[PDB]
Amino acid sequence: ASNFEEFVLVDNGGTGDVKVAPSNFANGVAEWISSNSRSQAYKVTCSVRQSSANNRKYTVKVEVPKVATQVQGGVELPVAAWRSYMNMELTIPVFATNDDCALIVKALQGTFKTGNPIATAIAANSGIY
Amino acid sequence: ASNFEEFVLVDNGGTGDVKVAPSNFANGVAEWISSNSRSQAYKVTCSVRQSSANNRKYTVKVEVPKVATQVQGGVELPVAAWRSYMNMELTIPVFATNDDCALIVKALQGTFKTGNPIATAIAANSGIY
Amino acid sequence: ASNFEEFVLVDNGGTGDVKVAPSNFANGVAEWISSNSRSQAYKVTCSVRQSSANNRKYTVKVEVPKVATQVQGGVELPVAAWRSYMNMELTIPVFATNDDCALIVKALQGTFKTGNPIATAIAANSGIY
Amino acid sequence: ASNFEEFVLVDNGGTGDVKVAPSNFANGVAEWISSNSRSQAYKVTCSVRQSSANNRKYTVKVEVPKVATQVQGGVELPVAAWRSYMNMELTIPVFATNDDCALIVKALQGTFKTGNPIATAIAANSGIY
Amino acid sequence: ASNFEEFVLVDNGGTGDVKVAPSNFANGVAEWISSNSRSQAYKVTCSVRQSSANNRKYTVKVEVPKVATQVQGGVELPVAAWRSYMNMELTIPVFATNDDCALIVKALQGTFKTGNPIATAIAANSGIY
Amino acid sequence: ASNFEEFVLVDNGGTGDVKVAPSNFANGVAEWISSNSRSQAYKVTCSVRQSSANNRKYTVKVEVPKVATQVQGGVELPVAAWRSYMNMELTIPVFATNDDCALIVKALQGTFKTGNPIATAIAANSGIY
Secondary structure (H helix, E strand, O other), X not given: OOOOOOXXXXXXXXXXXXXXXXXXXXXXXXXXXXXXXXXXXXXXXXXXXXXXXXXXXXXXXXXXXXXXXXXXXXXXXXXXXXXXXXXXXXEEEOOOOHHHHHHHHHHHHHHHOOOOHHHHHHHOOOOOO | OOOOOOEEEEOOOOOOOEXXXXXXXXXXXXXXXXXXXHHHOOEEEEEEEEOOOOEEEEEEEEEEEEEEEEXXXXXXXXXXXXXXXXXXXXXEEOOOOHHHHHHHHHHHHHHHOOOOHHHHHHHOOXXXX | OOOOOOEEXXXXXXXXXXXXXXXXXXXXXXXXXXXXXXXXXXXXXEEEEOOOOOEEEEEEXXXXXXXXXXXXXXXXXXXXXXXEEEEEEEEEEOOOOHHHHHHHHHHHHHHHOOOOHHHHHHHHOOOOO | OOOOOOEEEEOOOOOOOEEEEEEEOHHHOEEEEOOOOOOOOOEEEEEEEEOOOOEEEEEEEEEEEOXXXXXXXXXXXXXXXXXXXXXXXXXXXXXXXXXXXHHHHHHHHHHHOOOOHHHHHHHOOOOOO | OOOOXXXXXXXXXXXXXXXXXXXXXXXXOEEEEOOOXXXXXXXXXXXXXXXXXXXXXXXXXXXXXXXXXXXXXXXXXXXXXXXXXXXXXXXXXXXXXXXXXXXXXXXXXXXXXXOOHHHHHHHOOOOXX | OOOOOOEEEEOOOOOOOEEEEEEEOHHHOEXXXXXXXXXXXXXXXXXXXXXXXXXXXXXXXXXXXXXXXXXXXXXXXXXXXXXXXXXXXXXXXXXXXXXXXXXXXXXXXXXXXXXXXXXXXXXXXXXXX
């Protein structure tokens, strides 16, 4: 089996889906890259490292690119105009049963689900109010 | 309006929902607390701070608690046996149009959606393979 | 194929089979664990590295946990009272054909078959004599 | 009991099985061997000793020939092209009851049994994937 | 996709083709091997990693036996008389679109294809003239 | 014979085949280039040197150019926006017969055949997985 698999980061269902794929799995760092020029790929990575005696820590980052064409001295190139970076750390005890993990997950999803206040704020370039 | 509102962090639909609510909004730090003893509440926070000249940065953390009862010298108390901590930073340019934000969001959701490899790994206390 | 797959390490007929799943493959160690909290799981790992120019080495490890619930600071936690460790190292010439390997495997099994003396004495808290 | 007796290390159905007999018990180390030039022999050895004041250790080793193209009786150099070596340490807590050992054994059995991934990979001269 | 699958490395028309299968994926390095003593096997491996912040690198290697007078199964020393090694680095700019890569591939194909001079010379144990 | 000959590195049916010609043989590197300005040509090179007393090494390199016109000091010049580099090293025992070589060649081709996974992933901005 694997879970080191291709998947959709972005889902605007059926059409402009941004799919990401196994690039490489260097040092307990799994790298997922969207297709096309790396210069404007999306990227996701993850790792789990044991930190304290009681803790494991996942570390996940995501890169979303604004796409564009750089033109310089009459040479056009695919570049990212900029990128935004999400990056996170999750700590889970050792005593975490599987059910616990589940729960956690849900909480994460939970925070970011559309309509819930984080999720909305970000999408508005806005804060809380 | 507000977006500083109550909401569900955890959704196992209809029944054991973990709902979180406005606690306080101290210094550009919005705090959301589940009900009951704070000693075993879930918690979410967020802030947006402008960091560089071109960047805004959201900072979000979530705390999920393993609930239990501490008993000591015949006194029982509601405590968390432990907690796991998620915590993250998202950086978004200034040039981010609203549509861009949207996209980002989706990517985040995307990473954490059940079945996608992160999401699964965490829930298994597992890594990539 | 992808031989990386779950299997049952402990065959107790059908009732409480300690079955073990893939969990991590970071850095070329294949990790499989049971379905418990990390504080408690069975665990298996495997790896091969190419030692002299004439051999390879498989390295396999097995962790068996005696389970329980300990009370630290008046709270109860899942934990192992102790563990037993198996540890093994195997070296095969390069020139070993596929058949040659099979042999090994069988032999291995031979060693450990229920009723064959090693197998016995281990399980009897005994020495061979 | 008395364990030290012949057994079948390799069970080739009913025919061209290799039984391994007692060959030496010097130093409380049990030696079993097939019937061959020592160059070519299958050999098994095993010893328990107490190690930490919390553990005991069974120490088991198996040597298996390369048989493919082998020439019975020959001076086949260099020996290390011709043999694969197995090596094992099993650490078993002092508290383990007899049952606990059974379990252990089985776990071993488990890891190794045909069609389970270790087993398969060894025999295919393979890694995990 | 999922790429990691068996293929035919050597296409001997339809008969005595050598297919090469997945054998190891440790460290995100893809290993394919024929079905042989490792001494005698065909093997292919491949890895991408990002190198400069302008380049990526695929790193590909192929090992091919000397088969003439070969003795299947044997201890054939010294190994390096018996195998030819191929080695490759492909450096691909970050800007390359998927098409650009296609092209590249083809160029490779090109250099190598039967009846084109590299190809011919290798196979004649030859130089260019 | 004189295998030093032009050939088509890039087979695009019949329409814009990047065909490459002999250009230089100075110092035992065989150079072939496309028909562009030197600032822009595809290029291939090859050489063999006699490494240990037991092997030879072919060294082949391929240069693929992404073409364009840059304006330096308000004048336009033909130039490559970037290049991709292929680089390869091959080692054959001395004892390789002619057949043995053929094998190599084919294998090589095997690697890189359109649809066989290396070939694929390269062209897909992907890793094998």
